[PDB]
Design a protein around this ligand. Sequence first.
Ligand SMILES: CCCCCCCC(=O)c1cc(OC)c(OC)c(OC)c1CC(=O)OCC
Ligand SMILES: CCCCCCCC(=O)c1cc(OC)c(OC)c(OC)c1CC(=O)OCC
Ligand code: NA
Lengths: 239, 237
Amino acid sequence: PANLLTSLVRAHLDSGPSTAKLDYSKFQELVLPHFGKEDAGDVQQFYDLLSGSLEVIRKWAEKIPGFAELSPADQDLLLESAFLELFILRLAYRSKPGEGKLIFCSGLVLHRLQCARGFGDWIDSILAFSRSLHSLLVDVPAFACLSALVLITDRHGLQEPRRVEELQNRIASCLKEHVAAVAGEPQPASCLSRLLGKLPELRTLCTQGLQRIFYLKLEDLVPPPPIIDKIFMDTLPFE
Amino acid sequence: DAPANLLTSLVRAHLDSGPSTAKLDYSKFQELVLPHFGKEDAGDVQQFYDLLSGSLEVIRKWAEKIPGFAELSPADQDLLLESAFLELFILRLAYRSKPGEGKLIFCSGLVLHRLQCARGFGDWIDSILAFSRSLHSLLVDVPAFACLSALVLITDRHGLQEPRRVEELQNRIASCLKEHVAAVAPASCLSRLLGKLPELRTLCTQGLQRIFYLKLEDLVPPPPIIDKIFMDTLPFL
Ligand SMILES: CCCCCCCC(=O)c1cc(OC)c(OC)c(OC)c1CC(=O)OCC
Ligand SMILES: CCCCCCCC(=O)c1cc(OC)c(OC)c(OC)c1CC(=O)OCC
Ligand code: NA
């Protein structure tokens, strides 16, 4: 149970690596003593980790009941506008901040110190958020709704903002009755307002992502892939 | 007119572009403010912008005083000014500041404590004060600095209509600087100074990032000419 809750759960679990398909062939806890200060390699990896999730988040979104029923312009705006947030949220939930382990959606496992030069201090902020997310001890169905709710949310330029809002309300309702379905002791709506407290912090983290990309576009060692670029420019709110 | 003529003009342009020890404005200064670090409100951001704008109006009038500059084409004067503004704002602020006391001293005469700049400027201001210490330790005298800042401005820029008249004027100020440093008694102070250029370069980048961040945040609109400088400098636009 139940039918919305189970589709979400399935779309979530299907959009990422099983425990058995994790790839450690690249993971090095020891690296340094060095920097890039930015090397091409760092930057090209940063961007490749980013692009990797694109196709994955896009197929995940399609399995959300109702998402395929929004206008195609609305589907593309939600996806573009939520991309960085979904990338951070899913990374944060997937990773293991106690050990400094980042686990990407391909299955690829990397150490923080392997990510540092590419992501800059951003990786540290993501890790902090992941530490905080972990201690909320959020279950899979709660997570399945939370990420869906990051995607399905009001955005400037929506064609059918009311239909996006009814789809979001179904999801929030599903969430609310699921975290109340674990009743004793909590049943609180404290659990709830704590998990929902994680969305603004996420938006703040996304801004830090846009900051890193601005910085890398500035130095121009290696251009972003056009779809990341398009999201950067389509979502920077300023002729 | 008819001592030291180009040099005299440079010094005189320099000195009239900034405050006398007597004209320092302690009216907003507080030796201790307790800021909420990492965040900023509209008065913070507006002061940051005003500080940038007033600096550019002042750099404009100083430039009008460099012999030859005001006879460059209008578009050339604009382009030189817009292209060097961040460099000049950082170099001039660091040169007159008092980092041993956490004091930023702007061209208008406004004195502000590092703590007071934290919210508008973010980390950038701390890094500018590092460059102040770095600059101050080279003991660049005022006539050397008059020539140096002027050479930051007068330099090749892509899109000049009259690049050779700019290079002609660049040659004039270099010969002028050389005469001066030879009149005041290998890898030289200038070589040493050129060695600080990467610091200045990074501080300009850090300025461009702070402005990006604040535009993203959008508490208040930026001044048009500052916004145009930010936008013109982006190599991807
Ligand atoms: C390489 C750095 C060495 C340390 C010197 C620091 C610069 C300085 O405080 C200074 C000292 C002067 O007197 C010697 C002077 O001329 C009157 C001068 O120009 C206005 C300045 C510069 C200035 O920007 O102040 C105006 C408010
Ligand atoms: C044209 C593309 C060049 C990109 C390089 C970084 C641009 C920058 O930081 C900058 C931007 C400006 O305008 C935004 C500007 O004038 C205010 C300025 O003063 C020299 C600098 C400083 C500078 O160019 O030297 C250190 C980097
Ligand atoms: Na992902």
